[PDB]
RNA sequence: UUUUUUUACUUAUUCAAUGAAGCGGGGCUGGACUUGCGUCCAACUUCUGGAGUUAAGGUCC
């Protein structure tokens, strides 16, 4: 029904587009995702958002991966709320 | 005495659905003014033959089959749970509590009247021999008939041998001394 | 082709038709006292309520937490018998050669280990990080460090596995393991791993080990009682 | 379904939280009756 | 050391805590022989102060008495 | 917050049975009522003093 965004922060290096991908396709369905870069280098940010198809699958792999430590890095899984995601987050994605 | 007279152990074939036996021998228990009946049982669980022994009611014989169940018919010699036999219907052996094997109505000539049922809680309204109406679970098994035997203290004893002869395989106290016949010592009726 | 002489005998296994089958009887098996005993003994604890001391025990580290607390801790593991002997024989060597055991021999650091010593440590404010074992008995022997730790604030973390502590420290089993300080290489792993427990284990725990354990009613008794709620809801 | 998203959800949690080895292997008795192992004499 | 902090919980013999274990522990013993051997003593700091010690030779056993 | 009443539960304790054998909740099939699909209730052997036990068989290797 109701599609759920979530950010994650503090990605480590060499978790990106198609690792986060294929690790929260095992929790659901994703839909739209995109990792933060920077254009002048092409390099991430730490930084990237994940759009599941369903709001409660995002919510399960949001408090599933919160506070995961992660090659040094204490991951930052949060869900947005629809009153505060963009309507321009996933532009690019 | 060989055996007691109990019936079979409350299983999944009595609780569920019914079982056959064969009635083999009808035998005199001594110190029991009924006779007794072996049947044969198959076992469900194994290939050997189970046989037990039941209190024999008036009209069973040799090479008669018996049913054992829930879905037993209303016959003589057949046990069926008291859930599923109608009112007014005589019943012996009865169970005070389901799988106790038989307690109730045993001797010869004496029966229980199954007088009402109560199917909302689970209960049945009996009649004992002695008059007095108990309830009992619904799950209680009888045998349906009269114990056979009725009438054998109609006849007189008419002979001290014969109550001795009575009595001695019943390990019941003969003769009986009167406690007036005491000394005081002895009895407080004595003297 | 097939034997025209082979014959199908299908078993009517209904009531009193044929023998029954040997099935799984697994469920009815008579079973031997003390198997029966902690199984009672287990299902019991679960039945009543446990006070929130007990029953904070319950909530445990993660697989993850768990295998980076292991990792950082089995570079400290303690001296085995034949390293204590090489460095006593290059000890004596020192003295025999006149110097002092200080100069050959360096400080050492490793997990430190046993109830007392640790429960002193943290009583002193050294130990940086505790490790508690989840199965400890009698439980009062660890039923107060939690709350040690959080009067000394002290980050201790419940972890599965006394045994598991155990091979830490090269023992059968350690109740409480303990690190106090760690190499300057290893300086930044257990910050991060002390931030990690600190956001992922109690800051989670913080509310659930307040509560009561236990409580929970058996298969029978719950299919009872929903059968009595929907009953009561019908009518 | 609904309810098989949210089943799957739970079990990649499960997963993530505790490992894979969720199953355990136990017997098939055919009787009721335990008898002592047979042990090196 | 710990057994400080045994001591002064084992004093507080009506608390929450410790009434709970020894309803469990009165079930446990009740299910066992009437002599049985204990593998450790469940009062470590008693047995400790009574002079038991974790040496081959000290043994411990669980009995119980009709009052 | 405590003290009475009654009024349910089960985990202490108590009784009984069994070779601790089929308990409880679902699924399949049929029958009913219902609502227009939830309950409960049934699966299996009754003319005969025979016999029933070492899995037949199907399907992947």
């Given at each position: 029904?109701?599609?759920?965004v979530?950010?994650?922060?503090?990605?480590?290096?060499?978790?990106?587009?198609?690792?986060?991908?294929?690790?929260?396709?095992?929790?659901?369905?994703?839909?739209?995702?995109?990792?933060?870069?920077?254009?002048?280098?092409?390099?991430?940010?730490?930084?990237?958002?994940?759009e599941?198809?369903?709001?409660?699958?995002?919510?399960?792999?949001?408090?599933?991966?919160?506070?995961?430590?992660?090659?040094?890095?204490?991951?930052?899984?949060?869900?947005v709320?629809p009153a505060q995601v963009h309507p321009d987050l996933f532009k690019?994605? | 005495?060989?055996?007691?007279?109990?019936?079979?152990?409350?299983?999944?074939?009595?609780?569920?659905?019914?079982?056959?036996?064969?009635?083999?021998?009808?035998?005199?228990?001594?110190?029991?003014?009924?006779?007794?009946?072996?049947?044969?049982?198959?076992?469900?669980?194994?290939?050997?033959?189970?046989?037990?022994?039941?209190?024999?009611?008036?009209?069973?014989?040799?090479?008669?089959?018996?049913?054992?169940?829930?879905?037993?018919?209303?016959?003589?010699?057949?046990?069926?749970?008291?859930?599923?036999?109608?009112?007014?219907?005589?019943?012996?052996?009865?169970?005070?509590?389901?799988?106790?094997?038989?307690?109730?109505?045993?001797?010869?000539?004496?029966?229980?009247?199954?007088?009402?049922?109560?199917?909302?809680?689970?209960?049945?309204?009996?009649?004992?021999?002695?008059?007095?109406?108990?309830?009992?679970?619904?799950?209680?098994?009888?045998?349906?008939?009269?114990?056979?035997?009725?009438?054998?203290?109609?006849?007189?004893?008419?002979?001290?041998?014969?109550?001795?002869?009575?009595?001695?395989?019943?390990?019941?106290?003969?003769?009986?001394?009167?406690?007036?016949?005491?000394?005081?010592?002895?009895?407080?009726?004595?003297? | 082709?097939?034997?025209?002489?082979?014959?199908?005998?299908?078993?009517?296994?209904?009531?009193?038709?044929?023998?029954?089958?040997?099935?799984?009887?697994?469920?009815?098996?008579?079973?031997?006292?003390?198997?029966?005993?902690?199984?009672?003994?287990?299902?019991?604890?679960?039945?009543?309520?446990?006070?929130?001391?007990?029953?904070?025990?319950?909530?445990?580290?993660?697989?993850?937490?768990?295998?980076?607390?292991?990792?950082?801790?089995?570079?400290?593991?303690?001296?085995?018998?034949?390293?204590?002997?090489?460095?006593?024989?290059?000890?004596?060597?020192?003295?025999?050669?006149?110097?002092?055991?200080?100069?050959?021999?360096?400080?050492?650091?490793?997990?430190?280990?046993?109830?007392?010593?640790?429960?002193?440590?943290?009583?002193?404010?050294?130990?940086?990080?505790?490790?508690?074992?989840?199965?400890?008995?009698?439980?009062?022997?660890?039923?107060?460090?939690?709350?040690?730790?959080?009067?000394?604030?002290?980050?201790?973390?419940?972890?599965?596995?006394?045994?598991?502590?155990?091979?830490?420290?090269?023992?059968?089993?350690?109740?409480?393991?303990?690190?106090?300080?760690?190499?300057?290489?290893?300086?930044?792993?257990?910050?991060?791993?002390?931030?990690?427990?600190?956001?992922?284990?109690?800051?989670?725990?913080?509310?659930?080990?307040?509560?009561?354990?236990?409580?929970?009613?058996?298969?029978?008794?719950?299919?009872?009682?929903?059968?009595?709620?929907?009953?009561?809801?019908?009518? | 379904?609904?309810?098989?998203?949210?089943?799957?959800?739970?079990?990649?949690?499960?997963?993530?939280?505790?490992?894979?080895?969720?199953?355990?292997?136990?017997?098939?008795?055919?009787?009721?009756?335990?008898?002592?192992?047979?042990?090196?004499? | 050391?710990?057994?400080?902090?045994?001591?002064?919980?084992?004093?507080?013999?009506?608390?929450?805590?410790?009434?709970?274990?020894?309803?469990?522990?009165?079930?446990?013993?009740?299910?066992?022989?009437?002599?049985?051997?204990?593998?450790?003593?469940?009062?470590?700091?008693?047995?400790?102060?009574?002079?038991?010690?974790?040496?081959?030779?000290?043994?411990?056993?669980?009995?119980?008495?009709?009052?």
């Amino acid at each position: 029904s109701q599609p759920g965004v979530m950010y994650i922060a503090r990605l480590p290096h060499g978790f990106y587009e198609h690792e986060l991908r294929g690790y929260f396709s095992q929790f659901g369905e994703i839909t739209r995702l995109r990792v933060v870069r920077n254009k002048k280098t092409g390099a991430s940010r730490h930084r990237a958002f994940i759009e599941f198809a369903d709001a409660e699958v995002a919510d399960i792999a949001a408090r599933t991966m919160d506070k995961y430590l992660l090659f040094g890095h204490i991951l930052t899984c949060k869900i947005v709320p629809p009153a505060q995601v963009h309507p321009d987050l996933f532009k690019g994605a | 005495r060989k055996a007691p007279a109990k019936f079979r152990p409350l299983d999944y074939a009595e609780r569920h659905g019914y079982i056959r036996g064969i009635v083999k021998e009808i035998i005199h228990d001594p110190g029991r003014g009924a006779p007794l009946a072996r049947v044969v049982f198959r076992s469900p669980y194994k290939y050997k033959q189970i046989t037990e022994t039941f209190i024999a009611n008036e009209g069973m014989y040799t090479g008669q089959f018996i049913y054992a169940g829930k879905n037993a018919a209303l016959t003589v010699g057949n046990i069926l749970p008291l859930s599923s036999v109608p009112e007014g219907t005589v019943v012996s052996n009865v169970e005070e509590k389901p799988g106790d094997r038989g307690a109730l109505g045993r001797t010869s000539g004496n029966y229980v009247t199954v007088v009402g049922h109560n199917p909302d809680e689970g209960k049945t309204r009996i009649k004992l021999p002695s008059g007095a109406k108990k309830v009992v679970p619904s799950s209680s098994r009888g045998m349906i008939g009269i114990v056979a035997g009725g009438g054998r203290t109609d006849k007189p004893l008419l002979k001290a041998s014969r109550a001795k002869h009575k009595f001695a395989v019943k390990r019941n106290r003969w003769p009986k001394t009167r406690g007036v016949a005491m000394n005081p010592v002895d009895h407080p009726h004595g003297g | 082709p097939k034997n025209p002489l082979l014959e199908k005998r299908p078993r009517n296994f209904g009531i009193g038709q044929d023998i029954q089958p040997k099935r799984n009887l697994s469920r009815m098996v008579k079973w031997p006292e003390y198997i029966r005993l902690q199984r009672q003994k287990k299902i019991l604890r679960m039945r009543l309520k446990v006070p929130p001391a007990i029953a904070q025990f319950q909530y445990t580290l993660d697989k993850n937490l768990a295998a980076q607390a292991f990792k950082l801790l089995n570079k400290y593991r303690p001296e085995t018998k034949q390293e204590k002997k090489e460095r006593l024989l290059r000890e004596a060597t020192a003295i025999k050669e006149g110097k002092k055991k200080e100069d050959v021999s360096k400080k050492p650091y490793t997990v430190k280990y046993g109830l007392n010593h640790v429960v002193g440590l943290i009583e002193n404010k050294k130990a940086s990080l505790v490790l508690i074992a989840n199965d400890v008995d009698p439980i009062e022997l660890v039923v107060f460090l939690p709350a040690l730790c959080r009067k000394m604030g002290i980050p201790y973390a419940i972890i599965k596995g006394k045994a598991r502590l155990g091979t830490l420290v090269h023992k059968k089993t350690a109740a409480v393991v303990a690190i106090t300080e760690v190499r300057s290489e290893d300086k930044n792993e257990l910050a991060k791993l002390i931030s990690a427990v600190k956001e992922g284990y109690l800051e989670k725990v913080e509310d659930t080990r307040k509560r009561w354990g236990g409580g929970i009613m058996g298969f029978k008794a719950q299919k009872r009682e929903e059968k009595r709620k929907k009953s009561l809801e019908t009518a | 379904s609904k309810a098989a998203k949210g089943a799957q959800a739970k079990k990649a949690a499960q997963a993530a939280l505790k490992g894979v080895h969720s199953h355990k292997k136990t017997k098939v008795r055919k009787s009721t009756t335990f008898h002592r192992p047979k042990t090196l004499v | 050391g710990a057994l400080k902090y045994l001591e002064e919980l084992s004093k507080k013999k009506q608390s929450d805590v410790v009434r709970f274990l020894l309803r469990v522990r009165c079930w446990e013993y009740r299910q066992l022989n009437v002599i049985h051997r204990a593998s450790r003593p469940s009062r470590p700091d008693k047995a400790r102060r009574l002079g038991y010690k974790a040496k081959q030779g000290y043994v411990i056993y669980r009995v119980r008495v009709r009052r």
